[PDB]
Amino acid sequence: NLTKEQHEWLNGWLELWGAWVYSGRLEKRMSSVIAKFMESVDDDGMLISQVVDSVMYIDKKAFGILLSYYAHGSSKHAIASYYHRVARPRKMLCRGGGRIQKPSLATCRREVDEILNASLFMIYPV
DNA sequence: CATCATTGAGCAAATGAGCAACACTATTCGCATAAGGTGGGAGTAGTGAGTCTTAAGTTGCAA
């Protein structure tokens, strides 16, 4: 797990990073997913963009979520809201049981939280 | 003599439903408008039979 100084440090880096990118100052060549986000609208931001694209290159879903939170500046609650909207029925050993249904909102909140913590966790040493 | 099935027993992991607390915005509510404007209007018209109640008119009748 990361610490909280690392949280605030790299948090501020992703704040100026997403504020830098979202103005449109980044090129297509960094990612086609970064290009995808730029279809939906300095060396610091390009260095970090190589970092974040390098680590979060492989998932692209939480990478897009990461752009939604930092580049766009969206609240966590709306992200888990739409994410609960796009939910499919899954197998979970629930408080209810191992039946197969669409999960609750608070579960989706937990998932945005843990994909946040794991995302930041995988970014930080890079 | 050993062992295991077999009956209790409780737990972590996970999750679904909240909670309070702040913070922000949509909606709603309440007040103002300076030349002058000083008695409504539709109201049905072809029911009849009865019954109770006043209201008034008349009329013995007694001091």
PDB file of C-alpha atoms (C1' of nucleotides) in Angstrom:
ATOM      1  CA  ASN A   1       0.000   0.000   0.000  1.00  0.00           C
ATOM      2  CA  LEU A   2       1.151   3.558  -0.627  1.00  0.00           C
ATOM      3  CA  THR A   3       1.550   6.161   2.063  1.00  0.00           C
ATOM      4  CA  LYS A   4      -0.346   9.405   2.260  1.00  0.00           C
ATOM      5  CA  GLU A   5       2.580  11.655   1.459  1.00  0.00           C
ATOM      6  CA  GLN A   6       2.961   9.610  -1.713  1.00  0.00           C
ATOM      7  CA  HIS A   7      -0.805  10.012  -2.160  1.00  0.00           C
ATOM      8  CA  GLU A   8      -0.700  13.799  -1.940  1.00  0.00           C
ATOM      9  CA  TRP A   9       2.572  14.040  -3.860  1.00  0.00           C
ATOM     10  CA  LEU A  10       1.621  11.981  -6.889  1.00  0.00           C
ATOM     11  CA  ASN A  11      -1.923  13.285  -6.441  1.00  0.00           C
ATOM     12  CA  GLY A  12      -0.708  16.820  -7.087  1.00  0.00           C
ATOM     13  CA  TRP A  13       1.368  15.500  -9.974  1.00  0.00           C
ATOM     14  CA  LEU A  14      -1.734  13.962 -11.522  1.00  0.00           C
ATOM     15  CA  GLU A  15      -3.627  17.172 -10.905  1.00  0.00           C
ATOM     16  CA  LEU A  16      -1.192  19.306 -12.888  1.00  0.00           C
ATOM     17  CA  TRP A  17      -0.757  16.365 -15.225  1.00  0.00           C
ATOM     18  CA  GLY A  18      -4.441  16.054 -16.087  1.00  0.00           C
ATOM     19  CA  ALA A  19      -4.835  19.827 -16.094  1.00  0.00           C
ATOM     20  CA  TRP A  20      -1.957  19.888 -18.568  1.00  0.00           C
ATOM     21  CA  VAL A  21      -3.261  17.116 -20.835  1.00  0.00           C
ATOM     22  CA  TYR A  22      -6.927  18.076 -20.812  1.00  0.00           C
ATOM     23  CA  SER A  23      -6.152  21.454 -22.341  1.00  0.00           C
ATOM     24  CA  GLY A  24      -5.109  19.416 -25.396  1.00  0.00           C
ATOM     25  CA  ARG A  25      -1.353  19.951 -25.279  1.00  0.00           C
ATOM     26  CA  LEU A  26      -0.562  16.263 -25.761  1.00  0.00           C
ATOM     27  CA  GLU A  27      -0.162  14.433 -29.053  1.00  0.00           C
ATOM     28  CA  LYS A  28      -1.832  11.365 -30.546  1.00  0.00           C
ATOM     29  CA  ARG A  29       1.409   9.396 -30.397  1.00  0.00           C
ATOM     30  CA  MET A  30       1.346   8.852 -26.628  1.00  0.00           C
ATOM     31  CA  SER A  31      -1.677   6.570 -26.804  1.00  0.00           C
ATOM     32  CA  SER A  32      -4.619   5.843 -29.026  1.00  0.00           C
ATOM     33  CA  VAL A  33      -6.510   5.820 -25.734  1.00  0.00           C
ATOM     34  CA  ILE A  34      -5.158   9.262 -24.892  1.00  0.00           C
ATOM     35  CA  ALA A  35      -6.166  10.051 -28.455  1.00  0.00           C
ATOM     36  CA  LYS A  36      -9.547   8.505 -27.628  1.00  0.00           C
ATOM     37  CA  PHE A  37      -9.931  10.869 -24.698  1.00  0.00           C
ATOM     38  CA  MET A  38      -8.873  13.796 -26.886  1.00  0.00           C
ATOM     39  CA  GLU A  39     -11.639  12.662 -29.241  1.00  0.00           C
ATOM     40  CA  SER A  40     -13.906  13.446 -26.285  1.00  0.00           C
ATOM     41  CA  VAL A  41     -13.215  17.117 -25.621  1.00  0.00           C
ATOM     42  CA  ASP A  42       4.858  20.644 -20.940  1.00  0.00           C
ATOM     43  CA  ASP A  43       7.614  18.086 -20.671  1.00  0.00           C
ATOM     44  CA  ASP A  44       6.327  17.369 -17.179  1.00  0.00           C
ATOM     45  CA  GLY A  45       3.041  16.147 -18.610  1.00  0.00           C
ATOM     46  CA  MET A  46       4.784  14.208 -21.370  1.00  0.00           C
ATOM     47  CA  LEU A  47       7.220  12.538 -18.962  1.00  0.00           C
ATOM     48  CA  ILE A  48       4.378  11.563 -16.644  1.00  0.00           C
ATOM     49  CA  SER A  49       2.270  10.648 -19.684  1.00  0.00           C
ATOM     50  CA  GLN A  50       4.989   8.198 -20.706  1.00  0.00           C
ATOM     51  CA  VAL A  51       4.950   6.904 -17.120  1.00  0.00           C
ATOM     52  CA  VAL A  52       1.183   6.512 -16.799  1.00  0.00           C
ATOM     53  CA  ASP A  53       0.772   5.227 -20.345  1.00  0.00           C
ATOM     54  CA  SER A  54       3.590   2.763 -19.696  1.00  0.00           C
ATOM     55  CA  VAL A  55       2.114   1.328 -16.489  1.00  0.00           C
ATOM     56  CA  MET A  56      -1.610   1.684 -17.235  1.00  0.00           C
ATOM     57  CA  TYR A  57      -1.124   0.864 -20.916  1.00  0.00           C
ATOM     58  CA  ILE A  58      -2.341  -2.678 -20.438  1.00  0.00           C
ATOM     59  CA  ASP A  59      -5.782  -2.164 -18.895  1.00  0.00           C
ATOM     60  CA  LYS A  60      -7.071   1.039 -20.593  1.00  0.00           C
ATOM     61  CA  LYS A  61     -10.343   0.909 -18.681  1.00  0.00           C
ATOM     62  CA  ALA A  62      -9.038   2.178 -15.366  1.00  0.00           C
ATOM     63  CA  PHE A  63      -6.704   4.309 -17.452  1.00  0.00           C
ATOM     64  CA  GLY A  64      -9.771   5.944 -18.971  1.00  0.00           C
ATOM     65  CA  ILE A  65     -11.264   6.141 -15.480  1.00  0.00           C
ATOM     66  CA  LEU A  66      -8.037   7.806 -14.398  1.00  0.00           C
ATOM     67  CA  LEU A  67      -8.476  10.364 -17.153  1.00  0.00           C
ATOM     68  CA  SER A  68     -12.078  10.859 -16.052  1.00  0.00           C
ATOM     69  CA  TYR A  69     -11.039  11.623 -12.503  1.00  0.00           C
ATOM     70  CA  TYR A  70      -7.921  13.634 -13.143  1.00  0.00           C
ATOM     71  CA  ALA A  71      -8.045  14.931 -16.696  1.00  0.00           C
ATOM     72  CA  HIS A  72     -11.728  15.763 -16.612  1.00  0.00           C
ATOM     73  CA  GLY A  73     -12.165  16.218 -12.883  1.00  0.00           C
ATOM     74  CA  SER A  74     -15.185  14.047 -12.160  1.00  0.00           C
ATOM     75  CA  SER A  75     -16.472  13.086  -8.748  1.00  0.00           C
ATOM     76  CA  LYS A  76     -15.987   9.533  -7.549  1.00  0.00           C
ATOM     77  CA  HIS A  77     -19.678   9.171  -6.818  1.00  0.00           C
ATOM     78  CA  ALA A  78     -20.755   9.916 -10.357  1.00  0.00           C
ATOM     79  CA  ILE A  79     -18.172   7.492 -11.720  1.00  0.00           C
ATOM     80  CA  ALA A  80     -19.459   4.708  -9.512  1.00  0.00           C
ATOM     81  CA  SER A  81     -22.965   5.849 -10.393  1.00  0.00           C
ATOM     82  CA  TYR A  82     -22.544   5.353 -14.157  1.00  0.00           C
ATOM     83  CA  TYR A  83     -20.491   2.240 -13.380  1.00  0.00           C
ATOM     84  CA  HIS A  84     -23.408   0.846 -11.445  1.00  0.00           C
ATOM     85  CA  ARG A  85     -25.529   1.841 -14.411  1.00  0.00           C
ATOM     86  CA  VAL A  86     -23.465  -0.227 -16.840  1.00  0.00           C
ATOM     87  CA  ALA A  87     -23.426  -3.216 -14.503  1.00  0.00           C
ATOM     88  CA  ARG A  88     -23.864  -6.791 -15.575  1.00  0.00           C
ATOM     89  CA  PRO A  89     -24.965  -9.702 -13.409  1.00  0.00           C
ATOM     90  CA  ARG A  90     -21.984 -11.505 -11.913  1.00  0.00           C
ATOM     91  CA  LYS A  91     -21.205 -14.239  -9.384  1.00  0.00           C
ATOM     92  CA  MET A  92     -20.503 -12.841  -5.925  1.00  0.00           C
ATOM     93  CA  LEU A  93     -20.696 -14.647  -2.559  1.00  0.00           C
ATOM     94  CA  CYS A  94     -22.909 -11.968  -1.272  1.00  0.00           C
ATOM     95  CA  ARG A  95     -24.421 -10.788   1.980  1.00  0.00           C
ATOM     96  CA  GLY A  96     -27.399 -12.182   0.098  1.00  0.00           C
ATOM     97  CA  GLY A  97     -25.661 -15.134  -1.482  1.00  0.00           C
ATOM     98  CA  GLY A  98     -23.832 -16.643  -4.436  1.00  0.00           C
ATOM     99  CA  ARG A  99     -26.727 -15.958  -6.788  1.00  0.00           C
ATOM    100  CA  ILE A 100     -26.072 -14.102 -10.016  1.00  0.00           C
ATOM    101  CA  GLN A 101     -27.274 -10.519 -10.178  1.00  0.00           C
ATOM    102  CA  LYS A 102     -26.345  -6.899 -10.647  1.00  0.00           C
ATOM    103  CA  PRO A 103     -24.325  -5.630  -7.675  1.00  0.00           C
ATOM    104  CA  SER A 104     -25.138  -2.733  -5.418  1.00  0.00           C
ATOM    105  CA  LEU A 105     -23.952   0.824  -5.598  1.00  0.00           C
ATOM    106  CA  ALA A 106     -21.711   0.627  -2.542  1.00  0.00           C
ATOM    107  CA  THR A 107     -19.939  -2.342  -4.085  1.00  0.00           C
ATOM    108  CA  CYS A 108     -19.260  -0.216  -7.145  1.00  0.00           C
ATOM    109  CA  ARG A 109     -17.959   2.501  -4.845  1.00  0.00           C
ATOM    110  CA  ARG A 110     -15.634  -0.066  -3.270  1.00  0.00           C
ATOM    111  CA  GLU A 111     -14.429  -1.091  -6.710  1.00  0.00           C
ATOM    112  CA  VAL A 112     -13.655   2.446  -7.827  1.00  0.00           C
ATOM    113  CA  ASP A 113     -11.792   2.885  -4.550  1.00  0.00           C
ATOM    114  CA  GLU A 114      -9.714  -0.245  -4.920  1.00  0.00           C
ATOM    115  CA  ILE A 115      -8.996   0.315  -8.588  1.00  0.00           C
ATOM    116  CA  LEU A 116      -7.941   3.784  -7.550  1.00  0.00           C
ATOM    117  CA  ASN A 117      -5.624   2.515  -4.829  1.00  0.00           C
ATOM    118  CA  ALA A 118      -4.211  -0.235  -7.023  1.00  0.00           C
ATOM    119  CA  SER A 119      -3.856   2.156  -9.948  1.00  0.00           C
ATOM    120  CA  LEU A 120      -1.940   4.729  -7.886  1.00  0.00           C
ATOM    121  CA  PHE A 121      -0.041   1.876  -6.282  1.00  0.00           C
ATOM    122  CA  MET A 122       1.158   0.547  -9.625  1.00  0.00           C
ATOM    123  CA  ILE A 123       1.980   4.019 -10.896  1.00  0.00           C
ATOM    124  CA  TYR A 124       4.006   5.396  -7.958  1.00  0.00           C
ATOM    125  CA  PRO A 125       7.505   3.809  -8.234  1.00  0.00           C
ATOM    126  CA  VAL A 126       7.509   4.586 -11.943  1.00  0.00           C
TER     127      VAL A 126
ATOM    128  C1'  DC B   1      -6.063 -49.588  20.527  1.00  0.00           C
ATOM    129  C1'  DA B   2      -6.705 -46.457  16.673  1.00  0.00           C
ATOM    130  C1'  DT B   3      -9.539 -43.525  13.641  1.00  0.00           C
ATOM    131  C1'  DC B   4     -13.021 -41.283  11.400  1.00  0.00           C
ATOM    132  C1'  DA B   5     -17.417 -39.765  10.598  1.00  0.00           C
ATOM    133  C1'  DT B   6     -20.159 -36.911  12.611  1.00  0.00           C
ATOM    134  C1'  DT B   7     -22.103 -33.738  15.161  1.00  0.00           C
ATOM    135  C1'  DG B   8     -21.284 -28.603  17.241  1.00  0.00           C
ATOM    136  C1'  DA B   9     -19.067 -24.113  16.868  1.00  0.00           C
ATOM    137  C1'  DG B  10     -17.571 -20.204  15.482  1.00  0.00           C
ATOM    138  C1'  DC B  11     -14.858 -17.219  12.098  1.00  0.00           C
ATOM    139  C1'  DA B  12     -12.985 -14.214   7.821  1.00  0.00           C
ATOM    140  C1'  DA B  13     -14.182 -12.613   3.632  1.00  0.00           C
ATOM    141  C1'  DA B  14     -17.166 -10.387   1.471  1.00  0.00           C
ATOM    142  C1'  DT B  15     -21.192  -7.346   0.591  1.00  0.00           C
ATOM    143  C1'  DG B  16     -25.565  -4.860   0.782  1.00  0.00           C
ATOM    144  C1'  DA B  17     -27.857  -1.339   3.001  1.00  0.00           C
ATOM    145  C1'  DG B  18     -26.843   2.915   5.559  1.00  0.00           C
ATOM    146  C1'  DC B  19     -25.356   7.419   7.904  1.00  0.00           C
ATOM    147  C1'  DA B  20     -24.029  11.851   8.937  1.00  0.00           C
ATOM    148  C1'  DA B  21     -22.115  15.734   7.541  1.00  0.00           C
ATOM    149  C1'  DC B  22     -20.971  19.267   4.530  1.00  0.00           C
ATOM    150  C1'  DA B  23     -21.627  21.613   0.221  1.00  0.00           C
ATOM    151  C1'  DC B  24     -23.643  23.113  -3.453  1.00  0.00           C
ATOM    152  C1'  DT B  25     -27.843  24.623  -6.572  1.00  0.00           C
ATOM    153  C1'  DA B  26     -32.864  24.399  -8.190  1.00  0.00           C
ATOM    154  C1'  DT B  27     -36.886  25.943  -6.984  1.00  0.00           C
ATOM    155  C1'  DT B  28     -40.072  28.600  -4.685  1.00  0.00           C
ATOM    156  C1'  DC B  29     -41.854  32.508  -2.347  1.00  0.00           C
ATOM    157  C1'  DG B  30     -42.654  37.046  -1.578  1.00  0.00           C
ATOM    158  C1'  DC B  31     -42.547  41.710  -2.767  1.00  0.00           C
ATOM    159  C1'  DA B  32     -43.731  46.034  -7.055  1.00  0.00           C
ATOM    160  C1'  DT B  33     -45.517  48.385 -10.980  1.00  0.00           C
ATOM    161  C1'  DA B  34     -47.689  55.982 -10.442  1.00  0.00           C
ATOM    162  C1'  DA B  35     -52.129  60.290 -15.876  1.00  0.00           C
ATOM    163  C1'  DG B  36     -56.867  57.472 -15.584  1.00  0.00           C
ATOM    164  C1'  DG B  37     -60.084  52.961 -15.020  1.00  0.00           C
ATOM    165  C1'  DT B  38     -65.145  54.279  -8.502  1.00  0.00           C
ATOM    166  C1'  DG B  39     -72.677  49.291  -8.471  1.00  0.00           C
ATOM    167  C1'  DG B  40     -73.444  41.529 -12.063  1.00  0.00           C
ATOM    168  C1'  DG B  41     -75.324  38.684 -14.263  1.00  0.00           C
ATOM    169  C1'  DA B  42     -77.260  34.879 -15.539  1.00  0.00           C
ATOM    170  C1'  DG B  43     -81.198  34.082 -13.283  1.00  0.00           C
ATOM    171  C1'  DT B  44     -86.373  29.182 -15.974  1.00  0.00           C
ATOM    172  C1'  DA B  45     -90.579  29.878 -17.254  1.00  0.00           C
ATOM    173  C1'  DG B  46     -94.141  22.269 -19.781  1.00  0.00           C
ATOM    174  C1'  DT B  47     -95.364  18.871 -12.794  1.00  0.00           C
ATOM    175  C1'  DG B  48     -98.398  17.122  -9.402  1.00  0.00           C
ATOM    176  C1'  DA B  49     -99.795  15.363  -4.932  1.00  0.00           C
ATOM    177  C1'  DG B  50     -99.489  15.799  -0.449  1.00  0.00           C
ATOM    178  C1'  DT B  51     -98.408  17.349   4.070  1.00  0.00           C
ATOM    179  C1'  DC B  52     -96.925  20.499   7.630  1.00  0.00           C
ATOM    180  C1'  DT B  53     -96.734  25.258   9.035  1.00  0.00           C
ATOM    181  C1'  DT B  54     -97.807  29.920   9.507  1.00  0.00           C
ATOM    182  C1'  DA B  55    -100.633  33.934   8.787  1.00  0.00           C
ATOM    183  C1'  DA B  56    -104.393  36.155   8.335  1.00  0.00           C
ATOM    184  C1'  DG B  57    -109.225  36.645   8.104  1.00  0.00           C
ATOM    185  C1'  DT B  58    -113.504  35.978  10.311  1.00  0.00           C
ATOM    186  C1'  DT B  59    -116.503  35.214  14.060  1.00  0.00           C
ATOM    187  C1'  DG B  60    -119.029  33.750  18.292  1.00  0.00           C
ATOM    188  C1'  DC B  61    -119.103  35.413  22.944  1.00  0.00           C
ATOM    189  C1'  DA B  62    -118.563  37.262  27.474  1.00  0.00           C
ATOM    190  C1'  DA B  63    -117.491  41.143  30.735  1.00  0.00           C
TER     191       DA B  63
END
